[PDB]
Each structure stands twice: as C-alpha cells, then as structure tokens.
Amino acid sequence: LFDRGVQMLLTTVGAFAAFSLMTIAVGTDYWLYSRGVCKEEVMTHSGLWRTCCLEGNFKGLCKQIDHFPEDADYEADTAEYFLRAVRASSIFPILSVILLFMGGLCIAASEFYKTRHNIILSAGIFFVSAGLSNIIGIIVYISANAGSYSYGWSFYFGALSFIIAEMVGVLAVHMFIDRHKQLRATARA
Amino acid sequence: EIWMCIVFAYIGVSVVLFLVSRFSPYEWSTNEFGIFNSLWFSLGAFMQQGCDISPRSLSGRIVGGVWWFFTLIIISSYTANLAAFLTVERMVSPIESAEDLSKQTEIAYGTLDSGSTKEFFRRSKIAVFDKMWTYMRSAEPSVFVRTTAEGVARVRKSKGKYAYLLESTMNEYIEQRKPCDTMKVGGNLDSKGYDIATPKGSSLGTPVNLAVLKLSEQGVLDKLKNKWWYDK
Amino acid sequence: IFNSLWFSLGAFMQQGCDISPRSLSGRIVGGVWWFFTLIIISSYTANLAAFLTVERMVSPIESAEDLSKQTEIAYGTLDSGSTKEFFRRSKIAVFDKMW
Amino acid sequence: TYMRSAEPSVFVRTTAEGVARVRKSKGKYAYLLESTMNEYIEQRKPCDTMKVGGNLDSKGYDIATPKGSSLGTPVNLAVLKLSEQGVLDKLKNKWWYDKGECTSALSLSNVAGVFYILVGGLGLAMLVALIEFCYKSR
Amino acid sequence: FLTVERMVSPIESAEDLSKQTEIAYGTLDSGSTKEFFRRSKIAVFDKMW
Amino acid sequence: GECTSALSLSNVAGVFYILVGGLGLAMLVALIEFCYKSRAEAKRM
Amino acid sequence: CVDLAAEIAKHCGFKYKLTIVGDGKYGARDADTKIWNGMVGELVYGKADIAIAPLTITLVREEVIDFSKPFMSLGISIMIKKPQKSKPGVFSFLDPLAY
C-alpha cells in the first residue's frame, strides 16, 4: 500500500504463512469433531484422510476414512461418484498447496531479473487461483460430509489460508500496478 | 457453512473483479474499480441495492453476472426457507384432546398398571378409547407404570415425550405443585364421583345426603376445592 | 441530512439511489443498513406468506375469567332459574364480578 | 422374460432373504410375493418396506378337511358365516394392524451448484482477461 | 396458492373417505352392501355407517 | 373398454405472450417514428 | 389361525387339540414315489382331522383333500423399500421452475 521494501517483505511473509497454513491443514487430521466408528459410536477427530478415535476405549488409534464403502453401497449417479473422487483425492486442496508453492517460487524469482515485471502478475494470478481452489475444496469437503459435528483447527487453518492467499494476491497485483506506473512515469520524462 | 461460504465467495469475487479490472495496463484509470471499490460493488450486489458503478470489460461483466446469479438464488432461497419455517411453525397444533393424542404416535401415553383408570380402557366401547387400549397393550417397552408417583416423574423426565392418564382431581393438584412443569390438557374421558360412605342402615345416611347437597348449592364445596387447589 | 434521509428511505424500499457513499465510514453505514433492510423485508414477506397460507381463528373468550375481565362482549343468564341464582349467591370473586 | 434373462440372477432362495435383499438395495430391487406376507412385513420394524400396486393374480387360503369326513360341511358354512359376520376381517385387522409395529435449515448441498457455477465463472473471467492481456502484449 | 395446492391430496382409501365430509357417499337402498356396514364392527367402517 | 411439483410453462405463458407483444409494439413504434422522420426530411431537403 | 380355530370350534361345538406339523411343509406330492407330505399328508393319511392354517387352495391339493371356501383372499404383490428422503442434486436450485 506504500513504499517498496515493505510490500515485498509483506508479500513474502504472507505467501509463506498461507503455504504453511494450508500444508498444516492438509497434513493434520483435525477437520471435523463428530460421532462415528473409530475402528460402539464414539466422538472422533476427523480430517481429509484418516478419522481417528477420541475419548474412547482405545484413544489415538487412527483409521483411514471410508470414501467408497463396500458391502452393497447401493450406488448412485456418476455425479456422486465424482464428488467422492474429488473428496478422497482432495485434488483441490492439493492443487491449492501446489499453487501456493508456485506463487512462492515466483515471488522468490522476482529478486533475480527484476526487469521481468510479469513474474509479479504471475504470482498474483497463482495466489488468486490458490484461493479459488481452497474455496472449491472447502465446498466439496462440506458437501461430501453432508451425506452433532464441529470443525477442527485444521479446517479453520485452511479457511484462514484462503483469506491470506487472496490478501497476498491483492498486494501482488498491486505491486504489478505500481511497477507499470514506474515505467509510464519515466517514459514521459 | 452456507454463511461461511457466502463470505468466502464474496471475498473471492471482489478480489477477482479487482484483478480483472486493473491488472492490464492496456486498460490504464478507465475504470473506478479498485480493491475498495470492488468490495463495495460486491456488497451492493449481494444486498440487491443500487450501485454507483458497473463493470465495463468482458471479464468484469462476467464476474458481475455470475455474482448476480449467485446473489439472486441465495436471496430467493433465504426468503423461501424463512417462509417455510414460519408456515410450518404456524400449523403446529398441540394435542388438546384425547382424540388428538390418539391420532398421533410421537408422544407416548400410558396409565397406571393397576387401577380403575386402567380397567376403563379395557372395557370400553367408544372408538377413541379402544384405539388407545390397543396402542398401549401392544407397545415396547410397556407404557404402564406401577405407581402414579413414579409415573408422574416420567412425564417430567421424558421432556414431553410421555403423557400420563390419571384422575382429573390429581391432575389439577399436581399441576399446581412445584416446579409446576406439568399441565392438564383436554377434557375428562369419563365421569366419576367422590362420595361420603356410611354403613348400611346407619342413621347418618339421610342427613349426610342432604348435607352434601346443601354445601354444593350454597357454594361451599366449590369454595373448598378452590381453596385447596388454587389458593394454596 | 435531507439527502441522507432520502438515501436511507430508498435503501429500505430497495428502490436504488441517485448517490452512494464513497468514504469508508459512509460505506460501513450503508452496508449495515442494507443488511438490515434485506433481513427485514425478507422477514415481512415470509410472515405474510405464512399468514396467507395457514388460517387460524381463535375465540376472544377461552375461560370463565376472560369473560369477566372484558366488557365488549355481553353475557347473561335466564330470567329466573338455577343458573341465575348460582351467580347471585356465589362468593368467589370471579363469579361475583360477573353477577 | 426379463428375470430369466437377467444378470445376476434375480431369484431368491427363501422369502426371508428376499425381504432383506430389498432393504439392502436402497430401492434398486423389487420383490414379488403374496399380498398377505407383504402386508405383514410392512407392519414390522423398522418399517422401511411398503406394498405398491394391486394383486397380479387371485388366490385363497382355506381350511382343509380329509375327503369323506363329516366335518367338511359344517366347517364350510362356518367360514361363510364368519366372513359375512365380519369376524374374519377383525381377526385380520387384529394380527396385522392392531399388533403391527408401525423445518430444517438449507444445507450447503442445496446451493453447491450455484457455488460451483460462481467459481467457474470467476475462473472463466480470469482466463478471458489473461488471454486479452496476452493478445495485447503480442 | 402454491403451498395450498401442494398440500391438496385427493381421496385414496375408505379411511381417508370416512374422515372428510366434503364429498358425500352412499350405497344401494338394499343388497349386501348395506348389511356389510351395519354388521361391521370395524371402527373405520362403523363411523361411515 | 373404451377409455408436477415444478412450475410448468403453462402457468407463465401469458407473461411470455405479453413480453413478445411488447417487443413487437416497440418495434412498430420505432419503425413508425423512423418513417415519419424520413418523410419530414425528404420534403424539407 | 389360533383365533380362527377357536371360532371354528365354537361354531360347530367340538373340542380340539392344536398341534404343529412335524414336517413343517404345507404339502406336496413326490414325483417318483407319489407320496404326499406336510399338512396334506397328515389329512390324507389320517394324522389329523382338520388343518386350520394358511393352506393355499390349488388344483393338485383339491383332488386329495377337501377345501372350505377361502377365509382370506390374496395374490402376488410388489414389495419395494420406502421412498425415503432423496439427497438434493448439485443443480437442484433450478427445481422450482421447469426446464
């Protein structure tokens, strides 16, 4: 919003914070506190991959989440199968992590060969896309679950990553706006 | 989660509109859509309120159109669900009679395990009374309770899921006892009476018979009942 | 002040506005007023729909006490009989007020 | 001709399994059986099976008597007397129905489609803007 | 209007027929139909009788 | 012998007819104005 | 059938003893040895005097024993699972209006 040295470091720390938060959200299985079989019905702390026992006979026993149940699953339309495929593979949260890493590499690459102003625009586009991918991942995860509960800290770690990704994306595009302003200012003079 | 995703979508739409309206220097500016103006446009679009600006580029107009469609659907859904909530709440009818209780099954009802009230249902010829008897005699677990005192606490314990059938005099008194969480509904199923008992051939038969009639007409009996049921 | 009143009135009726606030504080005021207006108008429409769908009619009188408390509705008994004498000789306050 | 030429075979070994097969298909299987058995199970817990349509054919349950027996005749009149007197209907009502055992907030799944459309439109707008900028740069 | 139309459900069985009174119903002046209802101890059919 | 939930087009066909009639009336009005203006210009010029 | 047996005996005024067929079969005829089993065999071979049970009235059974008029009529029906609430589709917001 002002100066140049602060904006670069602020974008760098924001990108790193978003990347670490989204990696933690994907990596840690605290996404939904709900009752379910952890191996009787018992409160469990779930994630994207493996739902794990909590306050039960054998706490700390972790089991992978059943995404395609067997034993007469009754089937459904191809849309529901696609939804389970996206939920199980988590292509959108993983794509968000990948886009955050690519934006971080682009921001880091701005120090070398600073005359290529399109790298900043590339970083901004990548951060905005990472935010959109996080949005799609959250919507898909909630829709898949909807088929008492409360969300863990990793879900809100991911939700906070989307906010920071868009906030950094705004600054990244803003930095590109000023860099082209610098070109216009010197060209006239 | 719908509200959370509405907030997230609003932020994303605002950021995308700002990006697609400003990032290109070849459009430098020609549009008053900054990050502050983009958020204001998105907020005004969601509230279906007038906007001081509209997007002019193809990408900005695409963003505006999809946001407008999303907003229209969401507002329509909110109004429709509010209407459904209020309407369904409006048709809620409390069970205010024995017929209403018979026609339903969510609220369980039972009687004493041994008494005059239980036997009245078994030997009954009215349509509603026999229907109630069929329901309780075939139900698991048994709705009948051995004692009234235990059954009275069952109504309070079952948070409205269990209903108790008992004498109206005890129903009115129990309703007036602390914590006064239970109430009497509907009308009396049958008609009984409390009488003063005297031995056959006793000399106190006729005077007591005329005494009871005297107290009823002058209002002493009605005054006595109200004193120990409502005043106390 | 006149234009602010006009803006708020137009915002409540969802009829657009010839001017919109440009400052941060004015925009905050406009946003909270817009949210209030949206919620209120949706609530009004939903309640009207619920009213028109389900028709409920109730009696002004539901018990003995309610009859005596009010006076818009009149009430009486036979000219001479057991029902009239009951109110004449009653000692409870609720019935004595009726008599 | 459909059931004979069906894979897997749609024939059940016993009636009880056919009841379970319906409950294990979530509406993807239909079982054909006598109406009396269907009405009985419909009135049993957890009450997830229902009877639809009319009777495909007509049959009857009767009281059997040995050939050349004296009780064959009075039994036959006994059934007719009870049927006209409504005793038979009451006993069916007693052992079938008398003794039988039988808003919410809008979730994200109701508007997930509009959310997907919104995000796809945002992506399309970003792609169009990037394409235009690339074309102008070239 | 639309909610009321959705709530409208036509007559299906004799149990639903017995409760409502908008549509009257009657049998023959004689024959086995009347004596069926008269001798019917079923509360569903007794109330129609 | 000898013998849904969603709103259908039939419930809102009248508004479609009104809309298309209004479009036609607008086209007719525009053409009449154009013809009148063209007639005025030719006589003057 | 126990209620029906009690009513059957009351009409005709005869005493009876309820028993369960050991074979646990309604009745059939062997293809090779031509010997009946189940309830039919009990009445044909004189192991019982009456069968008050859901015994189908059929052609092959009518020839070997006597059937009263059917006390209960029935036929083939269709059993399906209860319709149950259907999970809304992804694009279910277009439902209020036809395509």
UniProtKB/Swiss-Prot annotation, chain A:
| Entry annotated with the keyword Transmembrane helix | yes
**Tissue range of expression?**
Brain.
**Which residues are listed as membrane-spanning?**
8-28, 89-109, 119-139, 157-177
Q: What's a BP term from Gene Ontology annotated to this protein?
A: neurotransmitter receptor localization to postsynaptic specialization membrane
Q: Where in the cell is it found?
A: Membrane; Synapse, Synaptosome
Note the topology in the membrane: Multi-pass membrane protein
Instruction: Supply the alphabetized keyword list.
Output: Calcium, Calcium channel, Calcium transport, Glycoprotein, Ion channel, Ion transport, Membrane, Phosphoprotein, Synapse, Synaptosome, Transmembrane, Transmembrane helix, Transport, Voltage-gated channel
Q: Which GO terms describe its molecular function?
A: ionotropic glutamate receptor binding; voltage-gated calcium channel activity
Q: Which cysteines are joined by disulfide bonds?
A: none
Q: Which family does it belong to?
A: Belongs to the PMP-22/EMP/MP20 family. CACNG subfamily.
Question: Per its UniProt record, which disorder involves this protein?
Answer: Defects in Cacng2 cause the stargazer (stg) phenotype. Stg mice have spike-wave seizures characteristic of absence epilepsy, with accompanying defects in the cerebellum and inner ear.
Q: What does this protein do?
A: Regulates the trafficking and gating properties of AMPA-selective glutamate receptors (AMPARs). Promotes their targeting to the cell membrane and synapses and modulates their gating properties by slowing their rates of activation, deactivation and desensitization. Does not show subunit-specific AMPA receptor regulation and regulates all AMPAR subunits. Thought to stabilize the calcium channel in an inactivated (closed) state.
Q: What is this protein called?
A: Voltage-dependent calcium channel gamma-2 subunit
Please give the first and last residues shown and the length of the full protein. 3 to 214 of 323
Swiss-Prot record, chain E:
What residues bind L-glutamate, as annotated? Answer: S32, T33
Q: Where located?
A: Cell membrane; Postsynaptic cell membrane; Postsynaptic density membrane
Swiss-Prot/TrEMBL induction comment: Down-regulated in the pyramidal cell layer of CA1 in the hippocampus by global ischemia.
Site location (Crucial to convey clamshell closure to channel opening): I11
Which residues does the record list as Phosphoserine (modified residue)?
Answer: S40
* Source taxon at top rank: Eukaryota
Positions marked as site (Interaction with the cone snail toxin Con-ikot-ikot):
R38
PTM per UniProt? Palmitoylated. Depalmitoylated upon L-glutamate stimulation. Ubiquitinated by RNF167, leading to its degradation.
Where in the body, by tissue, does this protein show up? Detected in forebrain. Detected in dendrites of neuronal cells. Expressed in the pyramidal cell layers of CA1 and CA3 and in the granule cell layer of the dentate gyrus.
The coiled-coil segments of this chain are none
Described function: Ionotropic glutamate receptor that functions as a ligand-gated cation channel, gated by L-glutamate and glutamatergic agonists such as alpha-amino-3-hydroxy-5-methyl-4-isoxazolepropionic acid (AMPA), quisqualic acid, and kainic acid. L-glutamate acts as an excitatory neurotransmitter at many synapses in the central nervous system and plays an important role in fast excitatory synaptic transmission.
Q: Which family does it belong to?
A: Belongs to the glutamate-gated ion channel (TC 1.A.10.1) family. GRIA2 subfamily.
Q: What other facts are recorded?
A: The postsynaptic actions of L-glutamate are mediated by a variety of receptors that are named according to their selective agonists. This receptor binds AMPA (quisqualate) > L-glutamate > kainate.
- What the record says about its domains? The M4 transmembrane segment mediates tetramerization and is required for cell surface expression.
Swiss-Prot record, chain F:
Where does tissue-level expression of this protein occur? Detected in forebrain. Detected in dendrites of neuronal cells. Expressed in the pyramidal cell layers of CA1 and CA3 and in the granule cell layer of the dentate gyrus.
Modification after translation is described as: Palmitoylated. Depalmitoylated upon L-glutamate stimulation. In contrast, Cys-35 palmitoylation does not affect cell surface expression but regulates stimulation-dependent endocytosis. Ubiquitinated by RNF167, leading to its degradation.
Could you list the residues that carry lipid attachment of the S-palmitoyl cysteine kind.
C35
Q: What induces it?
A: Down-regulated in the pyramidal cell layer of CA1 in the hippocampus by global ischemia.
Q: Which residues cross the membrane?
A: 12-32
Q: Where is it localised?
A: Cell membrane; Postsynaptic cell membrane; Postsynaptic density membrane
Role played:
Ionotropic glutamate receptor that functions as a ligand-gated cation channel, gated by L-glutamate and glutamatergic agonists such as alpha-amino-3-hydroxy-5-methyl-4-isoxazolepropionic acid (AMPA), quisqualic acid, and kainic acid. L-glutamate acts as an excitatory neurotransmitter at many synapses in the central nervous system and plays an important role in fast excitatory synaptic transmission.
The free-text domain remark for this protein reads:
The M4 transmembrane segment mediates tetramerization and is required for cell surface expression.
Question: What family is reported?
Answer: Belongs to the glutamate-gated ion channel (TC 1.A.10.1) family. GRIA2 subfamily.
Q: What is this protein called?
A: Glutamate receptor 2
Q: Source gene?
A: Gria2
Swiss-Prot record, chain G:
Subcellular localization, as worded in the UniProt entry: Cell membrane; Postsynaptic cell membrane; Postsynaptic density membrane
Where would one find coiled-coil regions in this protein? none
Post-translational changes noted in the entry: Palmitoylated. Depalmitoylated upon L-glutamate stimulation. Ubiquitinated by RNF167, leading to its degradation.
Tissue specificity is:
Detected in forebrain. Detected in dendrites of neuronal cells. Expressed in the pyramidal cell layers of CA1 and CA3 and in the granule cell layer of the dentate gyrus.
Q: Where does L-glutamate bind?
A: P54, T56, R61
| Residues flagged as site, Interaction with the cone snail toxin Con-ikot-ikot | R29
Anything else known = The postsynaptic actions of L-glutamate are mediated by a variety of receptors that are named according to their selective agonists. This receptor binds AMPA (quisqualate) > L-glutamate > kainate.
> Function, please?
Ionotropic glutamate receptor that functions as a ligand-gated cation channel, gated by L-glutamate and glutamatergic agonists such as alpha-amino-3-hydroxy-5-methyl-4-isoxazolepropionic acid (AMPA), quisqualic acid, and kainic acid. L-glutamate acts as an excitatory neurotransmitter at many synapses in the central nervous system and plays an important role in fast excitatory synaptic transmission.
Q: What is recorded about the protein's domains? A: The M4 transmembrane segment mediates tetramerization and is required for cell surface expression.
Protein family membership? Belongs to the glutamate-gated ion channel (TC 1.A.10.1) family. GRIA2 subfamily.
Please report the name of this protein according to its UniProt entry: Glutamate receptor 2
